[PDB]
Symmetry: C4
Subunit: 181 residues, 4 copies
C-alpha cells in the first residue's frame, strides 16, 4: 500500500494488479486541458515527457496502452507514433463506441482495463472498467466517482503516476525501463 506518491488502498492495488490495458483521455489527462490555436489554422498541444517514460515502461512491461479522445488532430497521431501507441480513437465523444470496439479486437475483459479521465464525458467508460482513475484536477463531479484520484495534475505526470501504480501492483516497477520522450 506504500507508493512514491503516497499510500493507496488494498482495493486499488488489487484492481491495478489485474490491469492488461490502460486507456487514456488526451485533453486534461495527457495535457493540462489547453488547445493552442493560431491565425493560420495552426494547432499545438503539449505533452509531458515524464508521461512518455511511463507509457514506454507500460508498453515494454506487457501493459497495452490506448487513447480515446473527443477532439481529432494529426499531432495526436504523431505523439502516439513517438511513444509506440497503436490504438487511437479520435473524434469520439460517445466513448463507449470506441471502448466496445477496442475490447472486442483485443479480447480483454473490462475488469482488466484501467481508464484515466478528467471530465463527465469520460464517466460512462470509467463506470465499466476494473480501475477508474480521475486526475487530481479533474472536474469536481468526476472526482468522487473514480476508484483512484491521482496526486498529480493532468499534463503534469498524472499518467506517469498511473503507469507507476500499475507497474508497482504487478511487481514490474523496479525493473521497468523507458525513455523520457
Amino acid at each position: 500500500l506504500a507508493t512514491c506518491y503516497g499510500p493507496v488502498s488494498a482495493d486499488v492495488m488489487a484492481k491495478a494488479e489485474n490491469i492488461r490495458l490502460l486507456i487514456l483521455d488526451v485533453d486534461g489527462v495527457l495535457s493540462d486541458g489547453l488547445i493552442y490555436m493560431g491565425n493560420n489554422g495552426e494547432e499545438l498541444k503539449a505533452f509531458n515527457v515524464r508521461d512518455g517514460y511511463g507509457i514506454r515502461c507500460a508498453l515494454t512491461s506487457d501493459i497495452e496502452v490506448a487513447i480515446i479522445t473527443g477532439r481529432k488532430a494529426k499531432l495526436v497521431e504523431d505523439r502516439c507514433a513517438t511513444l509506440g501507441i497503436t490504438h487511437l480513437y479520435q473524434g469520439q465523444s460517445n466513448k463507449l463506441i470506441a471502448f466496445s470496439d477496442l475490447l472486442e479486437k483485443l479480447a480483454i475483459a473490462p475488469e482488466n482495463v484501467a481508464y484515466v479521465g478528467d471530465d463527465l464525458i469520460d464517466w460512462p467508460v470509467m463506470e465499466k472498467v476494473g480501475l477508474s482513475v480521475a486526475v487530481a484536477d479533474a472536474h469536481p463531479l468526476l472526482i468522487p466517482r473514480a476508484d483512484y484520484v491521482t496526486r498529480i495534475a493532468g499534463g503534469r505526470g498524472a499518467v506517469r503516476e498511473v503507469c507507476d501504480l500499475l507497474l508497482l501492483a504487478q511487481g514490474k516497477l523496479d525493473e521497468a525501463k523507458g525513455q523520457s520522450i
Copy 2:
C-alpha cells in the same frame, strides 16, 4: 446553495436561474490572459477543453453564448466554429455597443444576461446585466463589483464553472450533455 465548487448565495442562484444569454470576454476569461507572438507574425491563444464542454452544454440547454473582445484574431473565429458559437464581436473596446446589439438581435432583457469578465474594461457591461461574474484572478478592482466571483482562474475552467452554475440554477445540470473540445 451547495454547488460542486462551493456554496453560493440564494441571490446568485436566483440571478442564474433567469439567464438566457451568457456573454464572455476572451483574454483572461477563456484564456489565462496570454498572447503568444512570433517573429513571422504568428499568433496563438490557448483555450480550455473543460470550458468547451460547458459552452456545448449551455448552447444545447437553451442558453445562448456570445463573445465580446478587445483584440481581433482569426483564431478566435476558429474557436467559435469548434464550439458552435454564432455571436462573436472582436476589436471592441467599447463593449456597450456589442451588448446593445445582442439585446436587439436576441430580443432579450439585460436581467436575462450574464457576463464573465476579468478587467475594468468589462465593468460597463457587467454593471447592466442580471448576473455579473469576475473570474478568481480578475483585476483586484473588478472583483468586489461582481455578483459572483468564480473559484477557478481565467483559462482554467472559470467559464465551465459559470456554465455549471447556470445549468444547476435552471435544473438542467444532470441532463446536460456536451463535448470536451
Copy 3:
C-alpha cells in the same frame, strides 16, 4: 498608502508620484521568462493583456514607456506596435548605454524614471532611477535591492501593478483609459 495590491510605503508612493518615464525589461517582466523555440527556427513569446491595458493607461496619462532587453526579436517590435511603445532597445546586455540614450533623448532626470527588472543584469540601471522595481519572482539576489517588490509575478500582471501604482500616486488611476490588448 493603500493600493488594490496591498499597502505601500510613503517613500514608494512619493517616488511613484514623480515618474515621467517607465522602463521595462521584457523576459521575466512582461513575460514569465520563457523563450519558445521551434525546429524551423520559429520563436514565440507570451505577453499579458492585463499589462497591455496598464501600458495603454500610462501612455495616455503622460507617462512614457520604454523597453530595454538583452534578446532581439521581431515579435517584440510587433508587441510594441500594438501598444504604441516607440522607445525600444533590443540586443542590449549593457543596459546603461540604452538608459543614457533615453534620458538624453527625452530630457528627463533619473529620479523621474521607474525601472522594472527581474535579474542582476537590470541592477546597474535600477540603481540609478527614482523608483526601482523587482517583480515578485525576480532573482532572489535582486529582490532586496529594489525600492518596490511587486505582489504579482513576471508575465502575470507585475507591469499592470506598476502602471496602477504610478497612476494612483499621480491621481490619475480613476480616470485612466486603456485597451486590454
Copy 4:
C-alpha cells in the same frame, strides 16, 4: 553555507567547489517537461532566460556546460548556439555513452562533474558524478538519490540555482557576468 535559495550542507558545497563540467538534461530540467506538437509536424520547447544567464556565467567562469537528452530536435541545437554550448548529445537512450565521451574529450574525472536530472533515466550518470542534482519537481523516486535537491522547479530556474551554487562555492558568484537570453 548560506545561499540565496537557502542553506546547503558543507558536503554539497565542497562537492560544488570541485566542479569543472556541468551536465544538464533538457526536458524537465531546462524546461518544465512539456513538448509542444502541431498538426504540420511543428515542435516547440520553452527555455528560461534566467537559466541562460547562469549558463553564460558558468561558461565564462571556467565551468564547461554539456547537454545530454533522450529526444532530438533542431531547436535544441539552436538553443545551444544562443548560449555558446558546444557539447550536445541528442537522441541518447543510454546517457552513459555521452558521459564517457565527455570524460574522454575533456580529460576530466567524474568527481569534477555535476549532473542535473529529473527522471530515472538520469540516475546512471548521476550515480557516477561528484555532484548529482535532482530538480525540485523531479520524479519522486529520483529525489532522495541526489546530493542536492533544488528549491526551484525544472524550467523555472533550477539550472540557474545550480549555476549560482557552483559559482558561490568557487568564489566566482560576485564577479560572474552573463546575458539573460
